[PDB]
């Protein structure tokens, strides 16, 4: 439709520039006819999800790298992909002119963009807020008569979510997560710092907190928004830490277990929102498998927990097999879901690196990692930030796939945007990961899935500098002869028919 207008800021690759009159976009999605494949290619050298087509061939007589699809080796079904409508994201989006706002939202949520189908919604304030508040700051309101949504919700987040839903053809799922409770429910009486709910699960404090989730869902439902899931707390481990700088609420895994079993599970199940799924953890992966063991081996907690939400701070190393792998082995029927990821959080690295191919590769490598370890979806953090990586009331700035420069009424689509889009655009909800076997050792990262309609999608990431010729074999269908250029990412799509 409209190509990337590239701009360099001195990092390893380019951003695509959008403004009030222009943004890069795709034509309406169509599949290549049976016997043809589509390839979307992005490269450090500047290609941005460029479409080409090739033939599927009956024969192959190379001896080089062969990737054989395993369409009958089935893994997890995919929920989807998206990002977070924080106060910071909403403020940044709405600071653009109406035309630029629309082109930003279409970039993420339209079929002429990358087809996001998940939005994570903070329950009141977090670090990516400029005001500290909860929905029930009036103290000792245990029946939550004064619970209400402030303008951050009613004027900023909710209208933007509605606009996103209008632009999407794919059903969008919302996920809610709280950072802090009202301070009068907390041992330390502050939004931040070390502190937990007062008392113990099953008591008035805990019941009030569970009821606040229902009040939140009720309030959003009054605005005609329904949630797919909630998490039991954003990063519950954070509130166990002395001096924690911003909004938090500390739970040990035992506290979370008992809160879910006694309070949050029963309260949600008793409500009109009983179909909303409950995800535990919502925290970093080295807390697994221990946290899953503590919560899910209690049958009274386990019956309320639909899944385990994981956060990915891509700046930092941690094992995958020992965390996600072991958790899936122990609890295969409890889905894993990546509810937050970000990069740029180290104080000594530039929060926003406009055009960083490396940060793009961190996004796609993380997504592939997640999908190969059974994770059913992947959710970015802030949908948009300013060039400082904000706003953020504690200056905990980070990067975002879209960076807004309001002085030019312009926004920049980072490599991260395209790396995420190589997945989000091409993996409909209900797709199933399938196997993909390499004939020889190689430097590529790849994942294969099957759409609900049986079509194939393969993503190939090359983090190496070398162009790698390869062949994809679909045993039902034939061979795709291709190349994975150095510092590229490709998505391949084709129709599958059997004979
Ligand atoms: C939005 O960005 C576009 C693309 O850069 C601007 O349009 C370009 O303007 C330059 C300078 O006149 C032309 O040489 C290009 O040919 C234009 N490109 C296209 C695709 O039209 C546009 O002026 C910007 N809009 C605003 C409101 O600033
Ligand atoms: C379970 O859900 C029902 C709502 O259907 C709750 O019943 C309401 O309780 C409030 C007081 O908390 C009353 O003022 C309403 O009149 C009740 N409504 C109905 C329709 O019965 C019930 O309290 C909930 N139980 C819990 C949370 O333990
Ligand atoms: C191209 C194919 C099909 C392929 C088959 C087997 C192995 C490989 C490896 N070169 C890389 N893998 C270990 S991986 O692709 O399985 C992988 C990549 C990732 F980004 C995160 C991860 F945990 C595993 C490639
Ligand atoms: C494919 O393979 C066999 C090799 O013997 C041959 O019969 C056939 O003509 C080849 N070429 C094509 C285009 O199918
Ligand atoms: K209030
Ligand atoms: K930083």
């Amino acid at each position: 439709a409209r190509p990337c207008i590239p701009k360099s800021f001195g990092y390893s690759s380019v951003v695509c520039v959008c403004n009030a009159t222009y943004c890069d976009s795709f034509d309406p999605p169509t599949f290549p006819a049976l016997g043809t494949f589509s390839r979307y290619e992005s490269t450090r050298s500047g290609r941005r999800m460029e479409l080409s087509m090739g033939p599927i061939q009956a024969n192959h007589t190379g001896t080089g790298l062969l990737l054989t699809l395993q369409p009958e080796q089935k893994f997890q079904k995919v929920k989807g992909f998206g990002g977070a409508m924080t106060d910071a994201a909403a403020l940044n989006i709405l600071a653009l002119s109406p035309p630029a706002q629309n082109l930003l939202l279409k970039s993420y949520f339209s079929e002429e963009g990358i087809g996001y189908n998940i939005i994570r919604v903070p329950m009141a304030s977090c670090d990516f807020s400029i005001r500290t508040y909860t929905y029930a700051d009036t103290p000792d309101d245990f029946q939550l008569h004064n619970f209400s949504l402030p303008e951050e919700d009613t004027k900023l987040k909710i209208p933007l979510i509605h606009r996103a839903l209008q632009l999407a053809q794919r059903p969008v799922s919302l996920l809610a997560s709280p950072w802090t409770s009202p301070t009068w429910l907390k041992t330390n009486g502050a939004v931040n710092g070390k502190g937990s709910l007062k008392g113990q699960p099953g008591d008035i404090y805990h019941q009030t907190w569970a009821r606040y989730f229902v009040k939140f869902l009720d309030a959003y439902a009054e605005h005609k928004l329904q949630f797919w899931a909630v998490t039991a707390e954003n990063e519950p481990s954070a509130g166990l830490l002395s001096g924690y700088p911003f909004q938090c609420l500390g739970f040990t895994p035992e506290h979370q277990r008992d809160f879910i079993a006694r309070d949050l599970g029963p309260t949600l199940a008793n409500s009109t929102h009983h179909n909303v799924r409950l995800l535990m953890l919502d925290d970093q992966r080295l807390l697994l498998p221990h946290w899953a063991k503590v919560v899910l081996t209690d049958p009274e907690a386990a019956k309320y927990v639909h899944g385990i939400a994981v956060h990915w701070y891509l700046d930092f190393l941690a094992p995958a097999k020992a965390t996600l792998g072991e958790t899936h082995r122990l609890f295969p029927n409890t889905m894993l879901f990546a509810s937050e990821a970000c990069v740029g959080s180290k104080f000594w690295e530039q929060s926003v690196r406009l055009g960083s191919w490396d940060r793009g590769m961190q996004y796609s490598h993380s997504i592939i990692t997640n999908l190969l370890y059974h994770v059913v979806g992947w959710t970015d953090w802030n949908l948009a930030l300013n060039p400082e990586g904000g706003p953020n009331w504690v200056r905990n700035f980070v990067d975002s796939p879209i960076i807004v420069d309001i002085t030019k009424d312009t926004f920049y689509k980072q490599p991260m945007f395209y790396h995420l889009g190589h997945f989000s655009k091409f993996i409909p909800e209900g797709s199933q990961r399938v196997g993909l076997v390499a004939s020889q050792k190689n430097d590529l990262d790849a994942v294969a899935l099957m759409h609900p309609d049986g079509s194939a999608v393969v993503v190939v990431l090359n983090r190496s500098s070398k162009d790698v010729p390869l062949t994809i074999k679909d045993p039902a269908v034939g061979f795709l002869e291709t190349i994975s250029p150095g510092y590229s990412i490709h998505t391949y799509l084709w129709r599958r028919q059997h004979h």
Side-chain angles (χ1 to χ4, degrees), residues 3 28 49 98 101 132 144 221 272 280 288-289 333 344 405 432 436 465 480:
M49 298 181 76
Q101 292 170 16
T132 63
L144 296 176
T272 62
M280 65 167 282
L288 294 172
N333 299 317
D405 181 2
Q432 184 162 33
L436 185 64
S465 64
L480 291 72

CSV table of all heavy atoms in Angstrom, one decimal, residues 3 28 49 98 101 132 144 221 272 280 288-289 333 344 405 432 436 465 480:
chain,number,residue,atom,x,y,z
A,3,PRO,N,4.8,2.4,1.3
A,3,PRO,CA,6.1,2.0,1.8
A,3,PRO,C,6.6,2.8,3.0
A,3,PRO,O,6.2,4.0,3.2
A,3,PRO,CB,7.1,2.1,0.6
A,3,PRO,CG,6.5,3.3,-0.1
A,3,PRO,CD,5.0,3.1,0.0
A,28,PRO,N,-5.1,-4.6,1.8
A,28,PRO,CA,-5.9,-5.6,2.5
A,28,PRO,C,-5.3,-7.0,2.3
A,28,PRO,O,-4.8,-7.4,1.3
A,28,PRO,CB,-7.3,-5.5,1.9
A,28,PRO,CG,-7.4,-4.1,1.4
A,28,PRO,CD,-6.0,-3.9,0.9
A,49,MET,N,9.0,-5.2,6.0
A,49,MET,CA,7.8,-6.1,5.7
A,49,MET,C,7.4,-6.0,4.3
A,49,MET,O,6.2,-5.9,3.9
A,49,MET,CB,6.6,-5.9,6.7
A,49,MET,CG,7.0,-6.2,8.1
A,49,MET,SD,5.7,-6.0,9.4
A,49,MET,CE,4.8,-7.5,9.1
A,98,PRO,N,-5.4,14.3,15.3
A,98,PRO,CA,-6.3,13.2,15.0
A,98,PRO,C,-5.9,12.4,13.8
A,98,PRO,O,-6.0,11.2,13.9
A,98,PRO,CB,-7.7,14.0,14.8
A,98,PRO,CG,-7.6,15.1,15.8
A,98,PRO,CD,-6.1,15.6,15.6
A,101,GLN,N,-3.0,10.2,15.0
A,101,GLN,CA,-3.5,9.2,16.0
A,101,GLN,C,-4.1,8.0,15.2
A,101,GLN,O,-3.8,6.9,15.6
A,101,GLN,CB,-4.6,9.8,16.8
A,101,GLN,CG,-4.3,10.9,17.8
A,101,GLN,CD,-5.5,11.5,18.4
A,101,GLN,OE1,-6.6,11.0,18.3
A,101,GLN,NE2,-5.4,12.7,18.9
A,132,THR,N,-0.4,9.7,40.5
A,132,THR,CA,-0.6,8.5,41.2
A,132,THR,C,-2.0,8.6,41.7
A,132,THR,O,-2.5,9.5,42.3
A,132,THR,CB,0.5,8.3,42.3
A,132,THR,OG1,0.4,9.4,43.2
A,132,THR,CG2,1.9,8.3,41.8
A,144,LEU,N,-16.7,-0.1,48.8
A,144,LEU,CA,-16.2,0.5,47.5
A,144,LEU,C,-17.4,1.3,46.8
A,144,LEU,O,-17.6,1.3,45.6
A,144,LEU,CB,-15.7,-0.6,46.5
A,144,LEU,CG,-14.4,-1.3,47.1
A,144,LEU,CD1,-14.0,-2.4,46.1
A,144,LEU,CD2,-13.3,-0.3,47.2
A,221,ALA,N,-17.4,-2.4,31.8
A,221,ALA,CA,-18.6,-3.0,31.1
A,221,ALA,C,-19.6,-1.9,30.9
A,221,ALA,O,-20.3,-1.9,29.9
A,221,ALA,CB,-19.1,-4.2,31.9
A,272,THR,N,-20.9,-11.5,37.4
A,272,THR,CA,-21.3,-11.6,36.0
A,272,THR,C,-20.1,-11.8,35.1
A,272,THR,O,-20.2,-12.1,34.0
A,272,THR,CB,-22.1,-10.4,35.6
A,272,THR,OG1,-21.3,-9.3,35.7
A,272,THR,CG2,-23.4,-10.2,36.4
A,280,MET,N,-2.2,-16.1,36.9
A,280,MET,CA,-1.3,-15.9,38.1
A,280,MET,C,0.1,-15.4,37.6
A,280,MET,O,0.4,-15.4,36.4
A,280,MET,CB,-1.1,-17.2,38.8
A,280,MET,CG,-0.4,-18.3,38.1
A,280,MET,SD,0.1,-19.7,39.1
A,280,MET,CE,1.5,-19.0,39.9
A,288,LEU,N,9.6,-19.1,38.3
A,288,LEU,CA,9.1,-20.4,37.9
A,288,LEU,C,10.2,-21.4,37.9
A,288,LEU,O,11.4,-21.1,37.6
A,288,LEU,CB,8.5,-20.3,36.4
A,288,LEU,CG,7.3,-19.4,36.3
A,288,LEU,CD1,7.0,-19.3,34.8
A,288,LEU,CD2,6.1,-20.0,37.0
A,289,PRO,N,9.9,-22.7,38.2
A,289,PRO,CA,8.6,-23.2,38.4
A,289,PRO,C,8.0,-23.0,39.8
A,289,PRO,O,6.9,-23.3,40.0
A,289,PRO,CB,8.7,-24.7,38.1
A,289,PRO,CG,10.1,-24.9,38.5
A,289,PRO,CD,10.9,-23.7,38.0
A,333,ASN,N,-1.4,-28.4,31.5
A,333,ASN,CA,-2.7,-28.0,31.2
A,333,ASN,C,-3.0,-26.5,31.6
A,333,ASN,O,-4.1,-26.0,31.5
A,333,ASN,CB,-3.7,-28.9,31.9
A,333,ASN,CG,-3.5,-30.3,31.3
A,333,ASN,OD1,-3.4,-30.5,30.1
A,333,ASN,ND2,-3.6,-31.3,32.2
A,344,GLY,N,15.4,-1.5,26.9
A,344,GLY,CA,15.8,-0.1,27.2
A,344,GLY,C,15.8,0.3,28.6
A,344,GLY,O,15.9,1.5,28.9
A,405,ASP,N,6.8,12.1,18.4
A,405,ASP,CA,7.5,13.4,18.5
A,405,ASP,C,6.4,14.4,18.2
A,405,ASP,O,6.2,14.8,17.1
A,405,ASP,CB,8.7,13.5,17.6
A,405,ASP,CG,9.3,14.9,17.8
A,405,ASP,OD1,8.8,15.7,18.6
A,405,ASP,OD2,10.3,15.3,17.1
A,432,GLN,N,-2.1,-22.8,15.6
A,432,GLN,CA,-1.4,-23.8,16.5
A,432,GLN,C,0.0,-23.9,16.1
A,432,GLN,O,0.3,-24.1,14.9
A,432,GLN,CB,-2.2,-25.1,16.3
A,432,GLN,CG,-1.7,-26.2,17.3
A,432,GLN,CD,-2.7,-27.3,17.5
A,432,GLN,OE1,-3.4,-27.6,16.6
A,432,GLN,NE2,-2.7,-27.9,18.7
A,436,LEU,N,9.0,-28.0,13.2
A,436,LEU,CA,9.8,-27.6,12.1
A,436,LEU,C,11.2,-28.1,12.4
A,436,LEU,O,11.8,-27.7,13.3
A,436,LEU,CB,9.8,-26.1,12.0
A,436,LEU,CG,10.5,-25.5,10.7
A,436,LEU,CD1,9.8,-25.9,9.5
A,436,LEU,CD2,10.6,-24.0,10.8
A,465,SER,N,25.4,-12.4,10.4
A,465,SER,CA,25.7,-11.5,9.2
A,465,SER,C,25.7,-12.3,7.9
A,465,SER,O,25.8,-11.6,6.9
A,465,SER,CB,27.0,-10.9,9.5
A,465,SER,OG,28.0,-11.9,9.5
A,480,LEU,N,9.7,-24.8,-0.8
A,480,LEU,CA,9.9,-23.3,-0.9
A,480,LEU,C,11.4,-23.1,-0.9
A,480,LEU,O,12.1,-23.4,0.1
A,480,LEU,CB,9.3,-22.6,0.3
A,480,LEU,CG,7.8,-22.6,0.4
A,480,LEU,CD1,7.3,-23.9,0.8
A,480,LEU,CD2,7.4,-21.5,1.4
